[PDB]
Amino acid sequence: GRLRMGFFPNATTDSTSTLDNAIYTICDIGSDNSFEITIPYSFSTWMRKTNGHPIGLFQIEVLNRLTYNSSSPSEVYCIVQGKMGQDARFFCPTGSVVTFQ
Amino acid sequence: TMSPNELGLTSAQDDGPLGQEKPNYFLNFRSMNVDIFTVSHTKVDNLFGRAWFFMEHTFTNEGQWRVPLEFPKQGHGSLSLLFAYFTGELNIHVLFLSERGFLRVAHTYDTSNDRVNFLSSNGVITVPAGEQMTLSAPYYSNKPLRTVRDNNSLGYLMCKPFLTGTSTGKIEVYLSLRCPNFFFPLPAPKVT
Amino acid sequence: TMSPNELGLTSAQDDGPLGQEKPNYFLNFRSMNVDIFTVSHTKVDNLFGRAWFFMEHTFTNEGQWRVPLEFPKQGHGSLSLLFAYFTGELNIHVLFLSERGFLRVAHTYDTSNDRVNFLSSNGVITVPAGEQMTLSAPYYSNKPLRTVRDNNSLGYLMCKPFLTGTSTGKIEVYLSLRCPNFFFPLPAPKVT
Amino acid sequence: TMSPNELGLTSAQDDGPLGQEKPNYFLNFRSMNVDIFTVSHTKVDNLFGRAWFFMEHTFTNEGQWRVPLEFPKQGHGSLSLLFAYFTGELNIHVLFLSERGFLRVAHTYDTSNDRVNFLSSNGVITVPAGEQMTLSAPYYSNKPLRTVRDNNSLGYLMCKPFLTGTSTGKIEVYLSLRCPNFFFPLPAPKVT
Amino acid sequence: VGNEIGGNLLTKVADDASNILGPNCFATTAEPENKNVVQATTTVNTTNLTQHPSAPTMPFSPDFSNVDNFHSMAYDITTGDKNPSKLVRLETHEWTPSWARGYQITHVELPKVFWDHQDKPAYGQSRYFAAVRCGFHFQVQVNVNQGTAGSALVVYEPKPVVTYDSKLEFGAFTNLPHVLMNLAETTQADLCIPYVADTNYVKTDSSDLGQLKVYVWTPLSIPTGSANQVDVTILGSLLQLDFQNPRVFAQDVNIYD
Amino acid sequence: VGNEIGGNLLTKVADDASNILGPNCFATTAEPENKNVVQATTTVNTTNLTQHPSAPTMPFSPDFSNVDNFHSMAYDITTGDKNPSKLVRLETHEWTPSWARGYQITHVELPKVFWDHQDKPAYGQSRYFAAVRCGFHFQVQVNVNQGTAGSALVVYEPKPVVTYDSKLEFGAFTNLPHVLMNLAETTQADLCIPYVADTNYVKTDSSDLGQLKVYVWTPLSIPTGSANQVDVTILGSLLQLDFQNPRVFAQDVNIYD
């Protein structure tokens, strides 16, 4: 089956919307079932708050129903990971907003 | 040219060894590295080179102050919790808030509470009343590496104030480290 | 040597792009091209260079004959139905069956029925009574390509006979084309 | 370096052609060929070059002894049963146990029992009483190859003793072969 | 080591047992047309990942130049692309006589005015992007017969100025890109304004990046017989335009913190 | 990029952490013996397609020359092949005395006569093919004692002639490949006839390609005592034979339109 995951940068309205104009990636199930998606830096500034405005709207819509057979699952599990790009940078160290353990 | 692997199609089970700086692209995009400052604020030496509050002690007598120094789960120093082992110089910043007197300060990685009863050679620097000093304690540890988490990851700090009259006060302590050697990054911490 | 692909084992989903002159062999066999005539009868220029009946009109007055010329779904010209677009010279063969008179013949791709009311510059060739002519109409079309199927794929033909007395007759028309440019072959036609 | 194929991971359906001397290894191991004797005891010429009992016959008259010679399913000669065809010299060892007389010995691959009635040219070597001889019969077979199994795989042996008085006795026979040519090894035999 | 040798273990054997009539058998082994591969295709901000691709197809001896060699459309190939930067009428107000000096004739929301109506060349694209970075080229036109006189102040006011407008002293606005244009002398003013803001990019459909205004330097001195309906028009062109952030159709997105 | 590196990421690591005793581990990665390939084999007019082939096998140090070096069969290796072109007895009729000139002694269906009976060398193959193209070499034999005399006309008649035989003038048949053979002078006639027809190939088991006949040039003049039973025999050999179209066993197939 196929699955299209898009991303609208700095979007705030949490609502399902056509991803035709969003940065999307179509995922066709095969041997390497771990598709990625990159989001280029996008802000009105040369540097943005590490804790402020959202990164954007993340949506993963179904493109083609997950097919199966007598001996295969009718539904599967998915995991979403996140990291920084090779051009990632952090700048000013600030106070803390939470306490770890 | 660009391979499908660098276009997003990969396999999570083929990530080892740890540390793969693989480039990710698509039309109309490429990793763009733009700098705003003349140097990095992500480098361990720079970030940690900046102190952060630790704790405060209110003294009334000439008693001694023994405290297990540890990495913060509170300030920007928390970024250390991402590592497992540490080793290197340790900068201790002490503020002696007192009207008239002196503050003896020392540091050791020795766990024994008797090797400190005297302060012979444990670094007894003197901060006059109302003053503050920044002493850099060397890695005088008996263990090659300091698990970064331990309630005593950093060596113990000693403070025996030498007061003169009924005068009393409080000793605020904050700290940083000089050139830190961190190894074997572990999973990110949880929140309280 | 020969690959299994050229021995019959292939995949229908790997045929694109369209037009793969792949060779097929097996022991004791190889594509043998033997010619019987000095030239090809499959070439578009040759095949279509030969006319084919179109239609007939029986005149009684000096009226005009307007007819939408189109490709045949009947003669060897039907091979054109395998294409979608056409462009090039058009050979029109007209037979003027009359006792005494003249036949004005003209051709245009212009759809307007008024630009023909006069015949000023639409090619008014003259075939005397009982004669026949073959006029080659140029691609004076306002459209770069002529969908090959249209009821007017080919431009309209005009026939205004100039009779003298009560004489009447019939005008049989057949046609071919000079050097034809066909493009984008479409699926084969059905039968009635 | 070493491939996974040579480390044990293989496929039984990819063994043909027959006879693949593939090497097998793993750490701390390698095919080590150490010899104990100056020569091989596995070579067909050597192994079979050594005789083995066949059968015994007790004579009383001057009658003849005809016996279908065949390969043993009993002694070390059984290793021949692993083959299908044979061809080459045949060493026959005969022991003539008699008090006073002579033993005529002959050998032929001819199946006819009448070409032996005389012994004209079938090799009538003479072993005096109480003696023993080893005659090497050539491949005088009418068949290029001798199926190794046949009850007469080896040619027939003839023994017509020439006695003098009432004397009687027994003729023990054992045999080997000189340089044997075996072909097309067949599956191992079963046990009784 | 095996499992493919099917070709030369059959092609050779025959080549070894062949007579004057040649081999009686030929065997060839190779990989299937449908191999185990993965294809990736990327279009504008999109990436299609397929692990079961098939041989791409196309018409006979095709031409993908897509350019009409006959130019049935005589225009520049990049016409549609540059269209949004085209010069357009941003505003047209009437200079009402008896308006004291300093009085604001008319303003214009910059830069969202270029998408003022769905009939603006730039309105189309502007809707699919939340971020904008552009330069301007204004042409304020004011026509007045020779008999009449007067003067207007065409000046560009960045958000900073627009914000604190009342705190600024009129008559000093000449410090900003302006055009004191004396009527009866000039009928049009030209202003080239680059991207000016305290942020790298400005939110599309926002009044940020300032706004262009037209003030009354000296009121209109219209003689008795002379006409009294003077119109002030503001035209705008985009020296350079740049839409970056993708977003849903005309949905308010915050590029700011 | 991964998924195969299992060999040098284990072979090296140990080679990096090895002591005087050498590495404590070796890892090698490669492709399986059973790979994803396709094999194709073609024999005479056949093609076997297998997508799951296996390593072909064969006996120990085998010899596929298939030629008996001892020649237990002393014959030419191509004997069986040429066998069908062998000379054979096609017919044997008796020259009945008192037969006027022009009278037809005997005929022979060409070329289907070479497969006249299942005992004909060519009968075997002829059954597996519908098309034929061949050349002939006839040898009509007629023996007569010296005392007697006479003459016969051995002539080849293509289908055209055989069709319109009655329309042709006898005595002119000498225009066709013939052999006026005068008895008491010649005992055998030789005729080399190439493939003659109005079609490239002739349907197997057909009378097409004409037929060979033997006529009475001049009746037999047999003296009183002389014998009166003269036999005429027709032998045939195929200078060159060619069977092309495959077909079921002896099934009438139409190569013609």
Next chain:
Amino acid sequence: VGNEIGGNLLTKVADDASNILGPNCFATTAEPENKNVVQATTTVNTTNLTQHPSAPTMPFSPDFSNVDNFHSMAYDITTGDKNPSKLVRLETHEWTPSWARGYQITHVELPKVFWDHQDKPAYGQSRYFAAVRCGFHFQVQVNVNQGTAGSALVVYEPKPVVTYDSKLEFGAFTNLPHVLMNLAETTQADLCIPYVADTNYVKTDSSDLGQLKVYVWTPLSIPTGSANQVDVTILGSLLQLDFQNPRVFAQDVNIYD
């Protein structure tokens, strides 16, 4: 021939229909990270076969030398390895006065004595192997004050001797590797014994390979006041050791026929 061409049949097409703005599409095809391969790994007497391997992982910029550069353990790196060959106390019996010549003081089961107790350095490994081939270095120590005198015969007796011991003449045992050691002169005897047996290897935990004994050459002549408790000790070291046959933990295995 197809099924992979997805990259250059899409990468080119665009490269053929591209304008000043460059191609509007890029397509690349290749093999998946998870290919059809097989990995094999071999450790000591082990072989792991995997047909579905994955990219091996490891820590950041790792160091597999495994050697502590600070030597927090000051010993030879091969200490643990050689440990089992270490010298050990095999026996210590008391030379009971009034013991006639020829009397056997003490013996020692060779070679199973080196695994005499679970406290023997070699006991560990000896348990995981059934076969052994080694050399010995004995050091029989006997101390006696100067006042006293006497002599003992330290001799090595292979299985052959031990078997037929009573059949051998004492006083001739000097033919075997021995050390007539005269007390009051020598306090220790040294014996280097190589692997001696009628079989290439000896079963671990067996008395084979003989045994070392200590006899009374001449009884102890202990004066009145002198001490009377003389102790004889046997120490053993393995010049060279070799454990080959693998086996369950301390399970009797027969290497012999």
Next chain:
RNA sequence: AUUUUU
């Protein structure tokens, strides 16, 4: 057929 031995 160094298919006696080197």
Next chain:
RNA sequence: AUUUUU
């Protein structure tokens, strides 16, 4: 350990 800075 350009593991103060170049």
Next chain:
RNA sequence: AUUUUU
């Protein structure tokens, strides 16, 4: 457009 013919 050797898209009359060589």
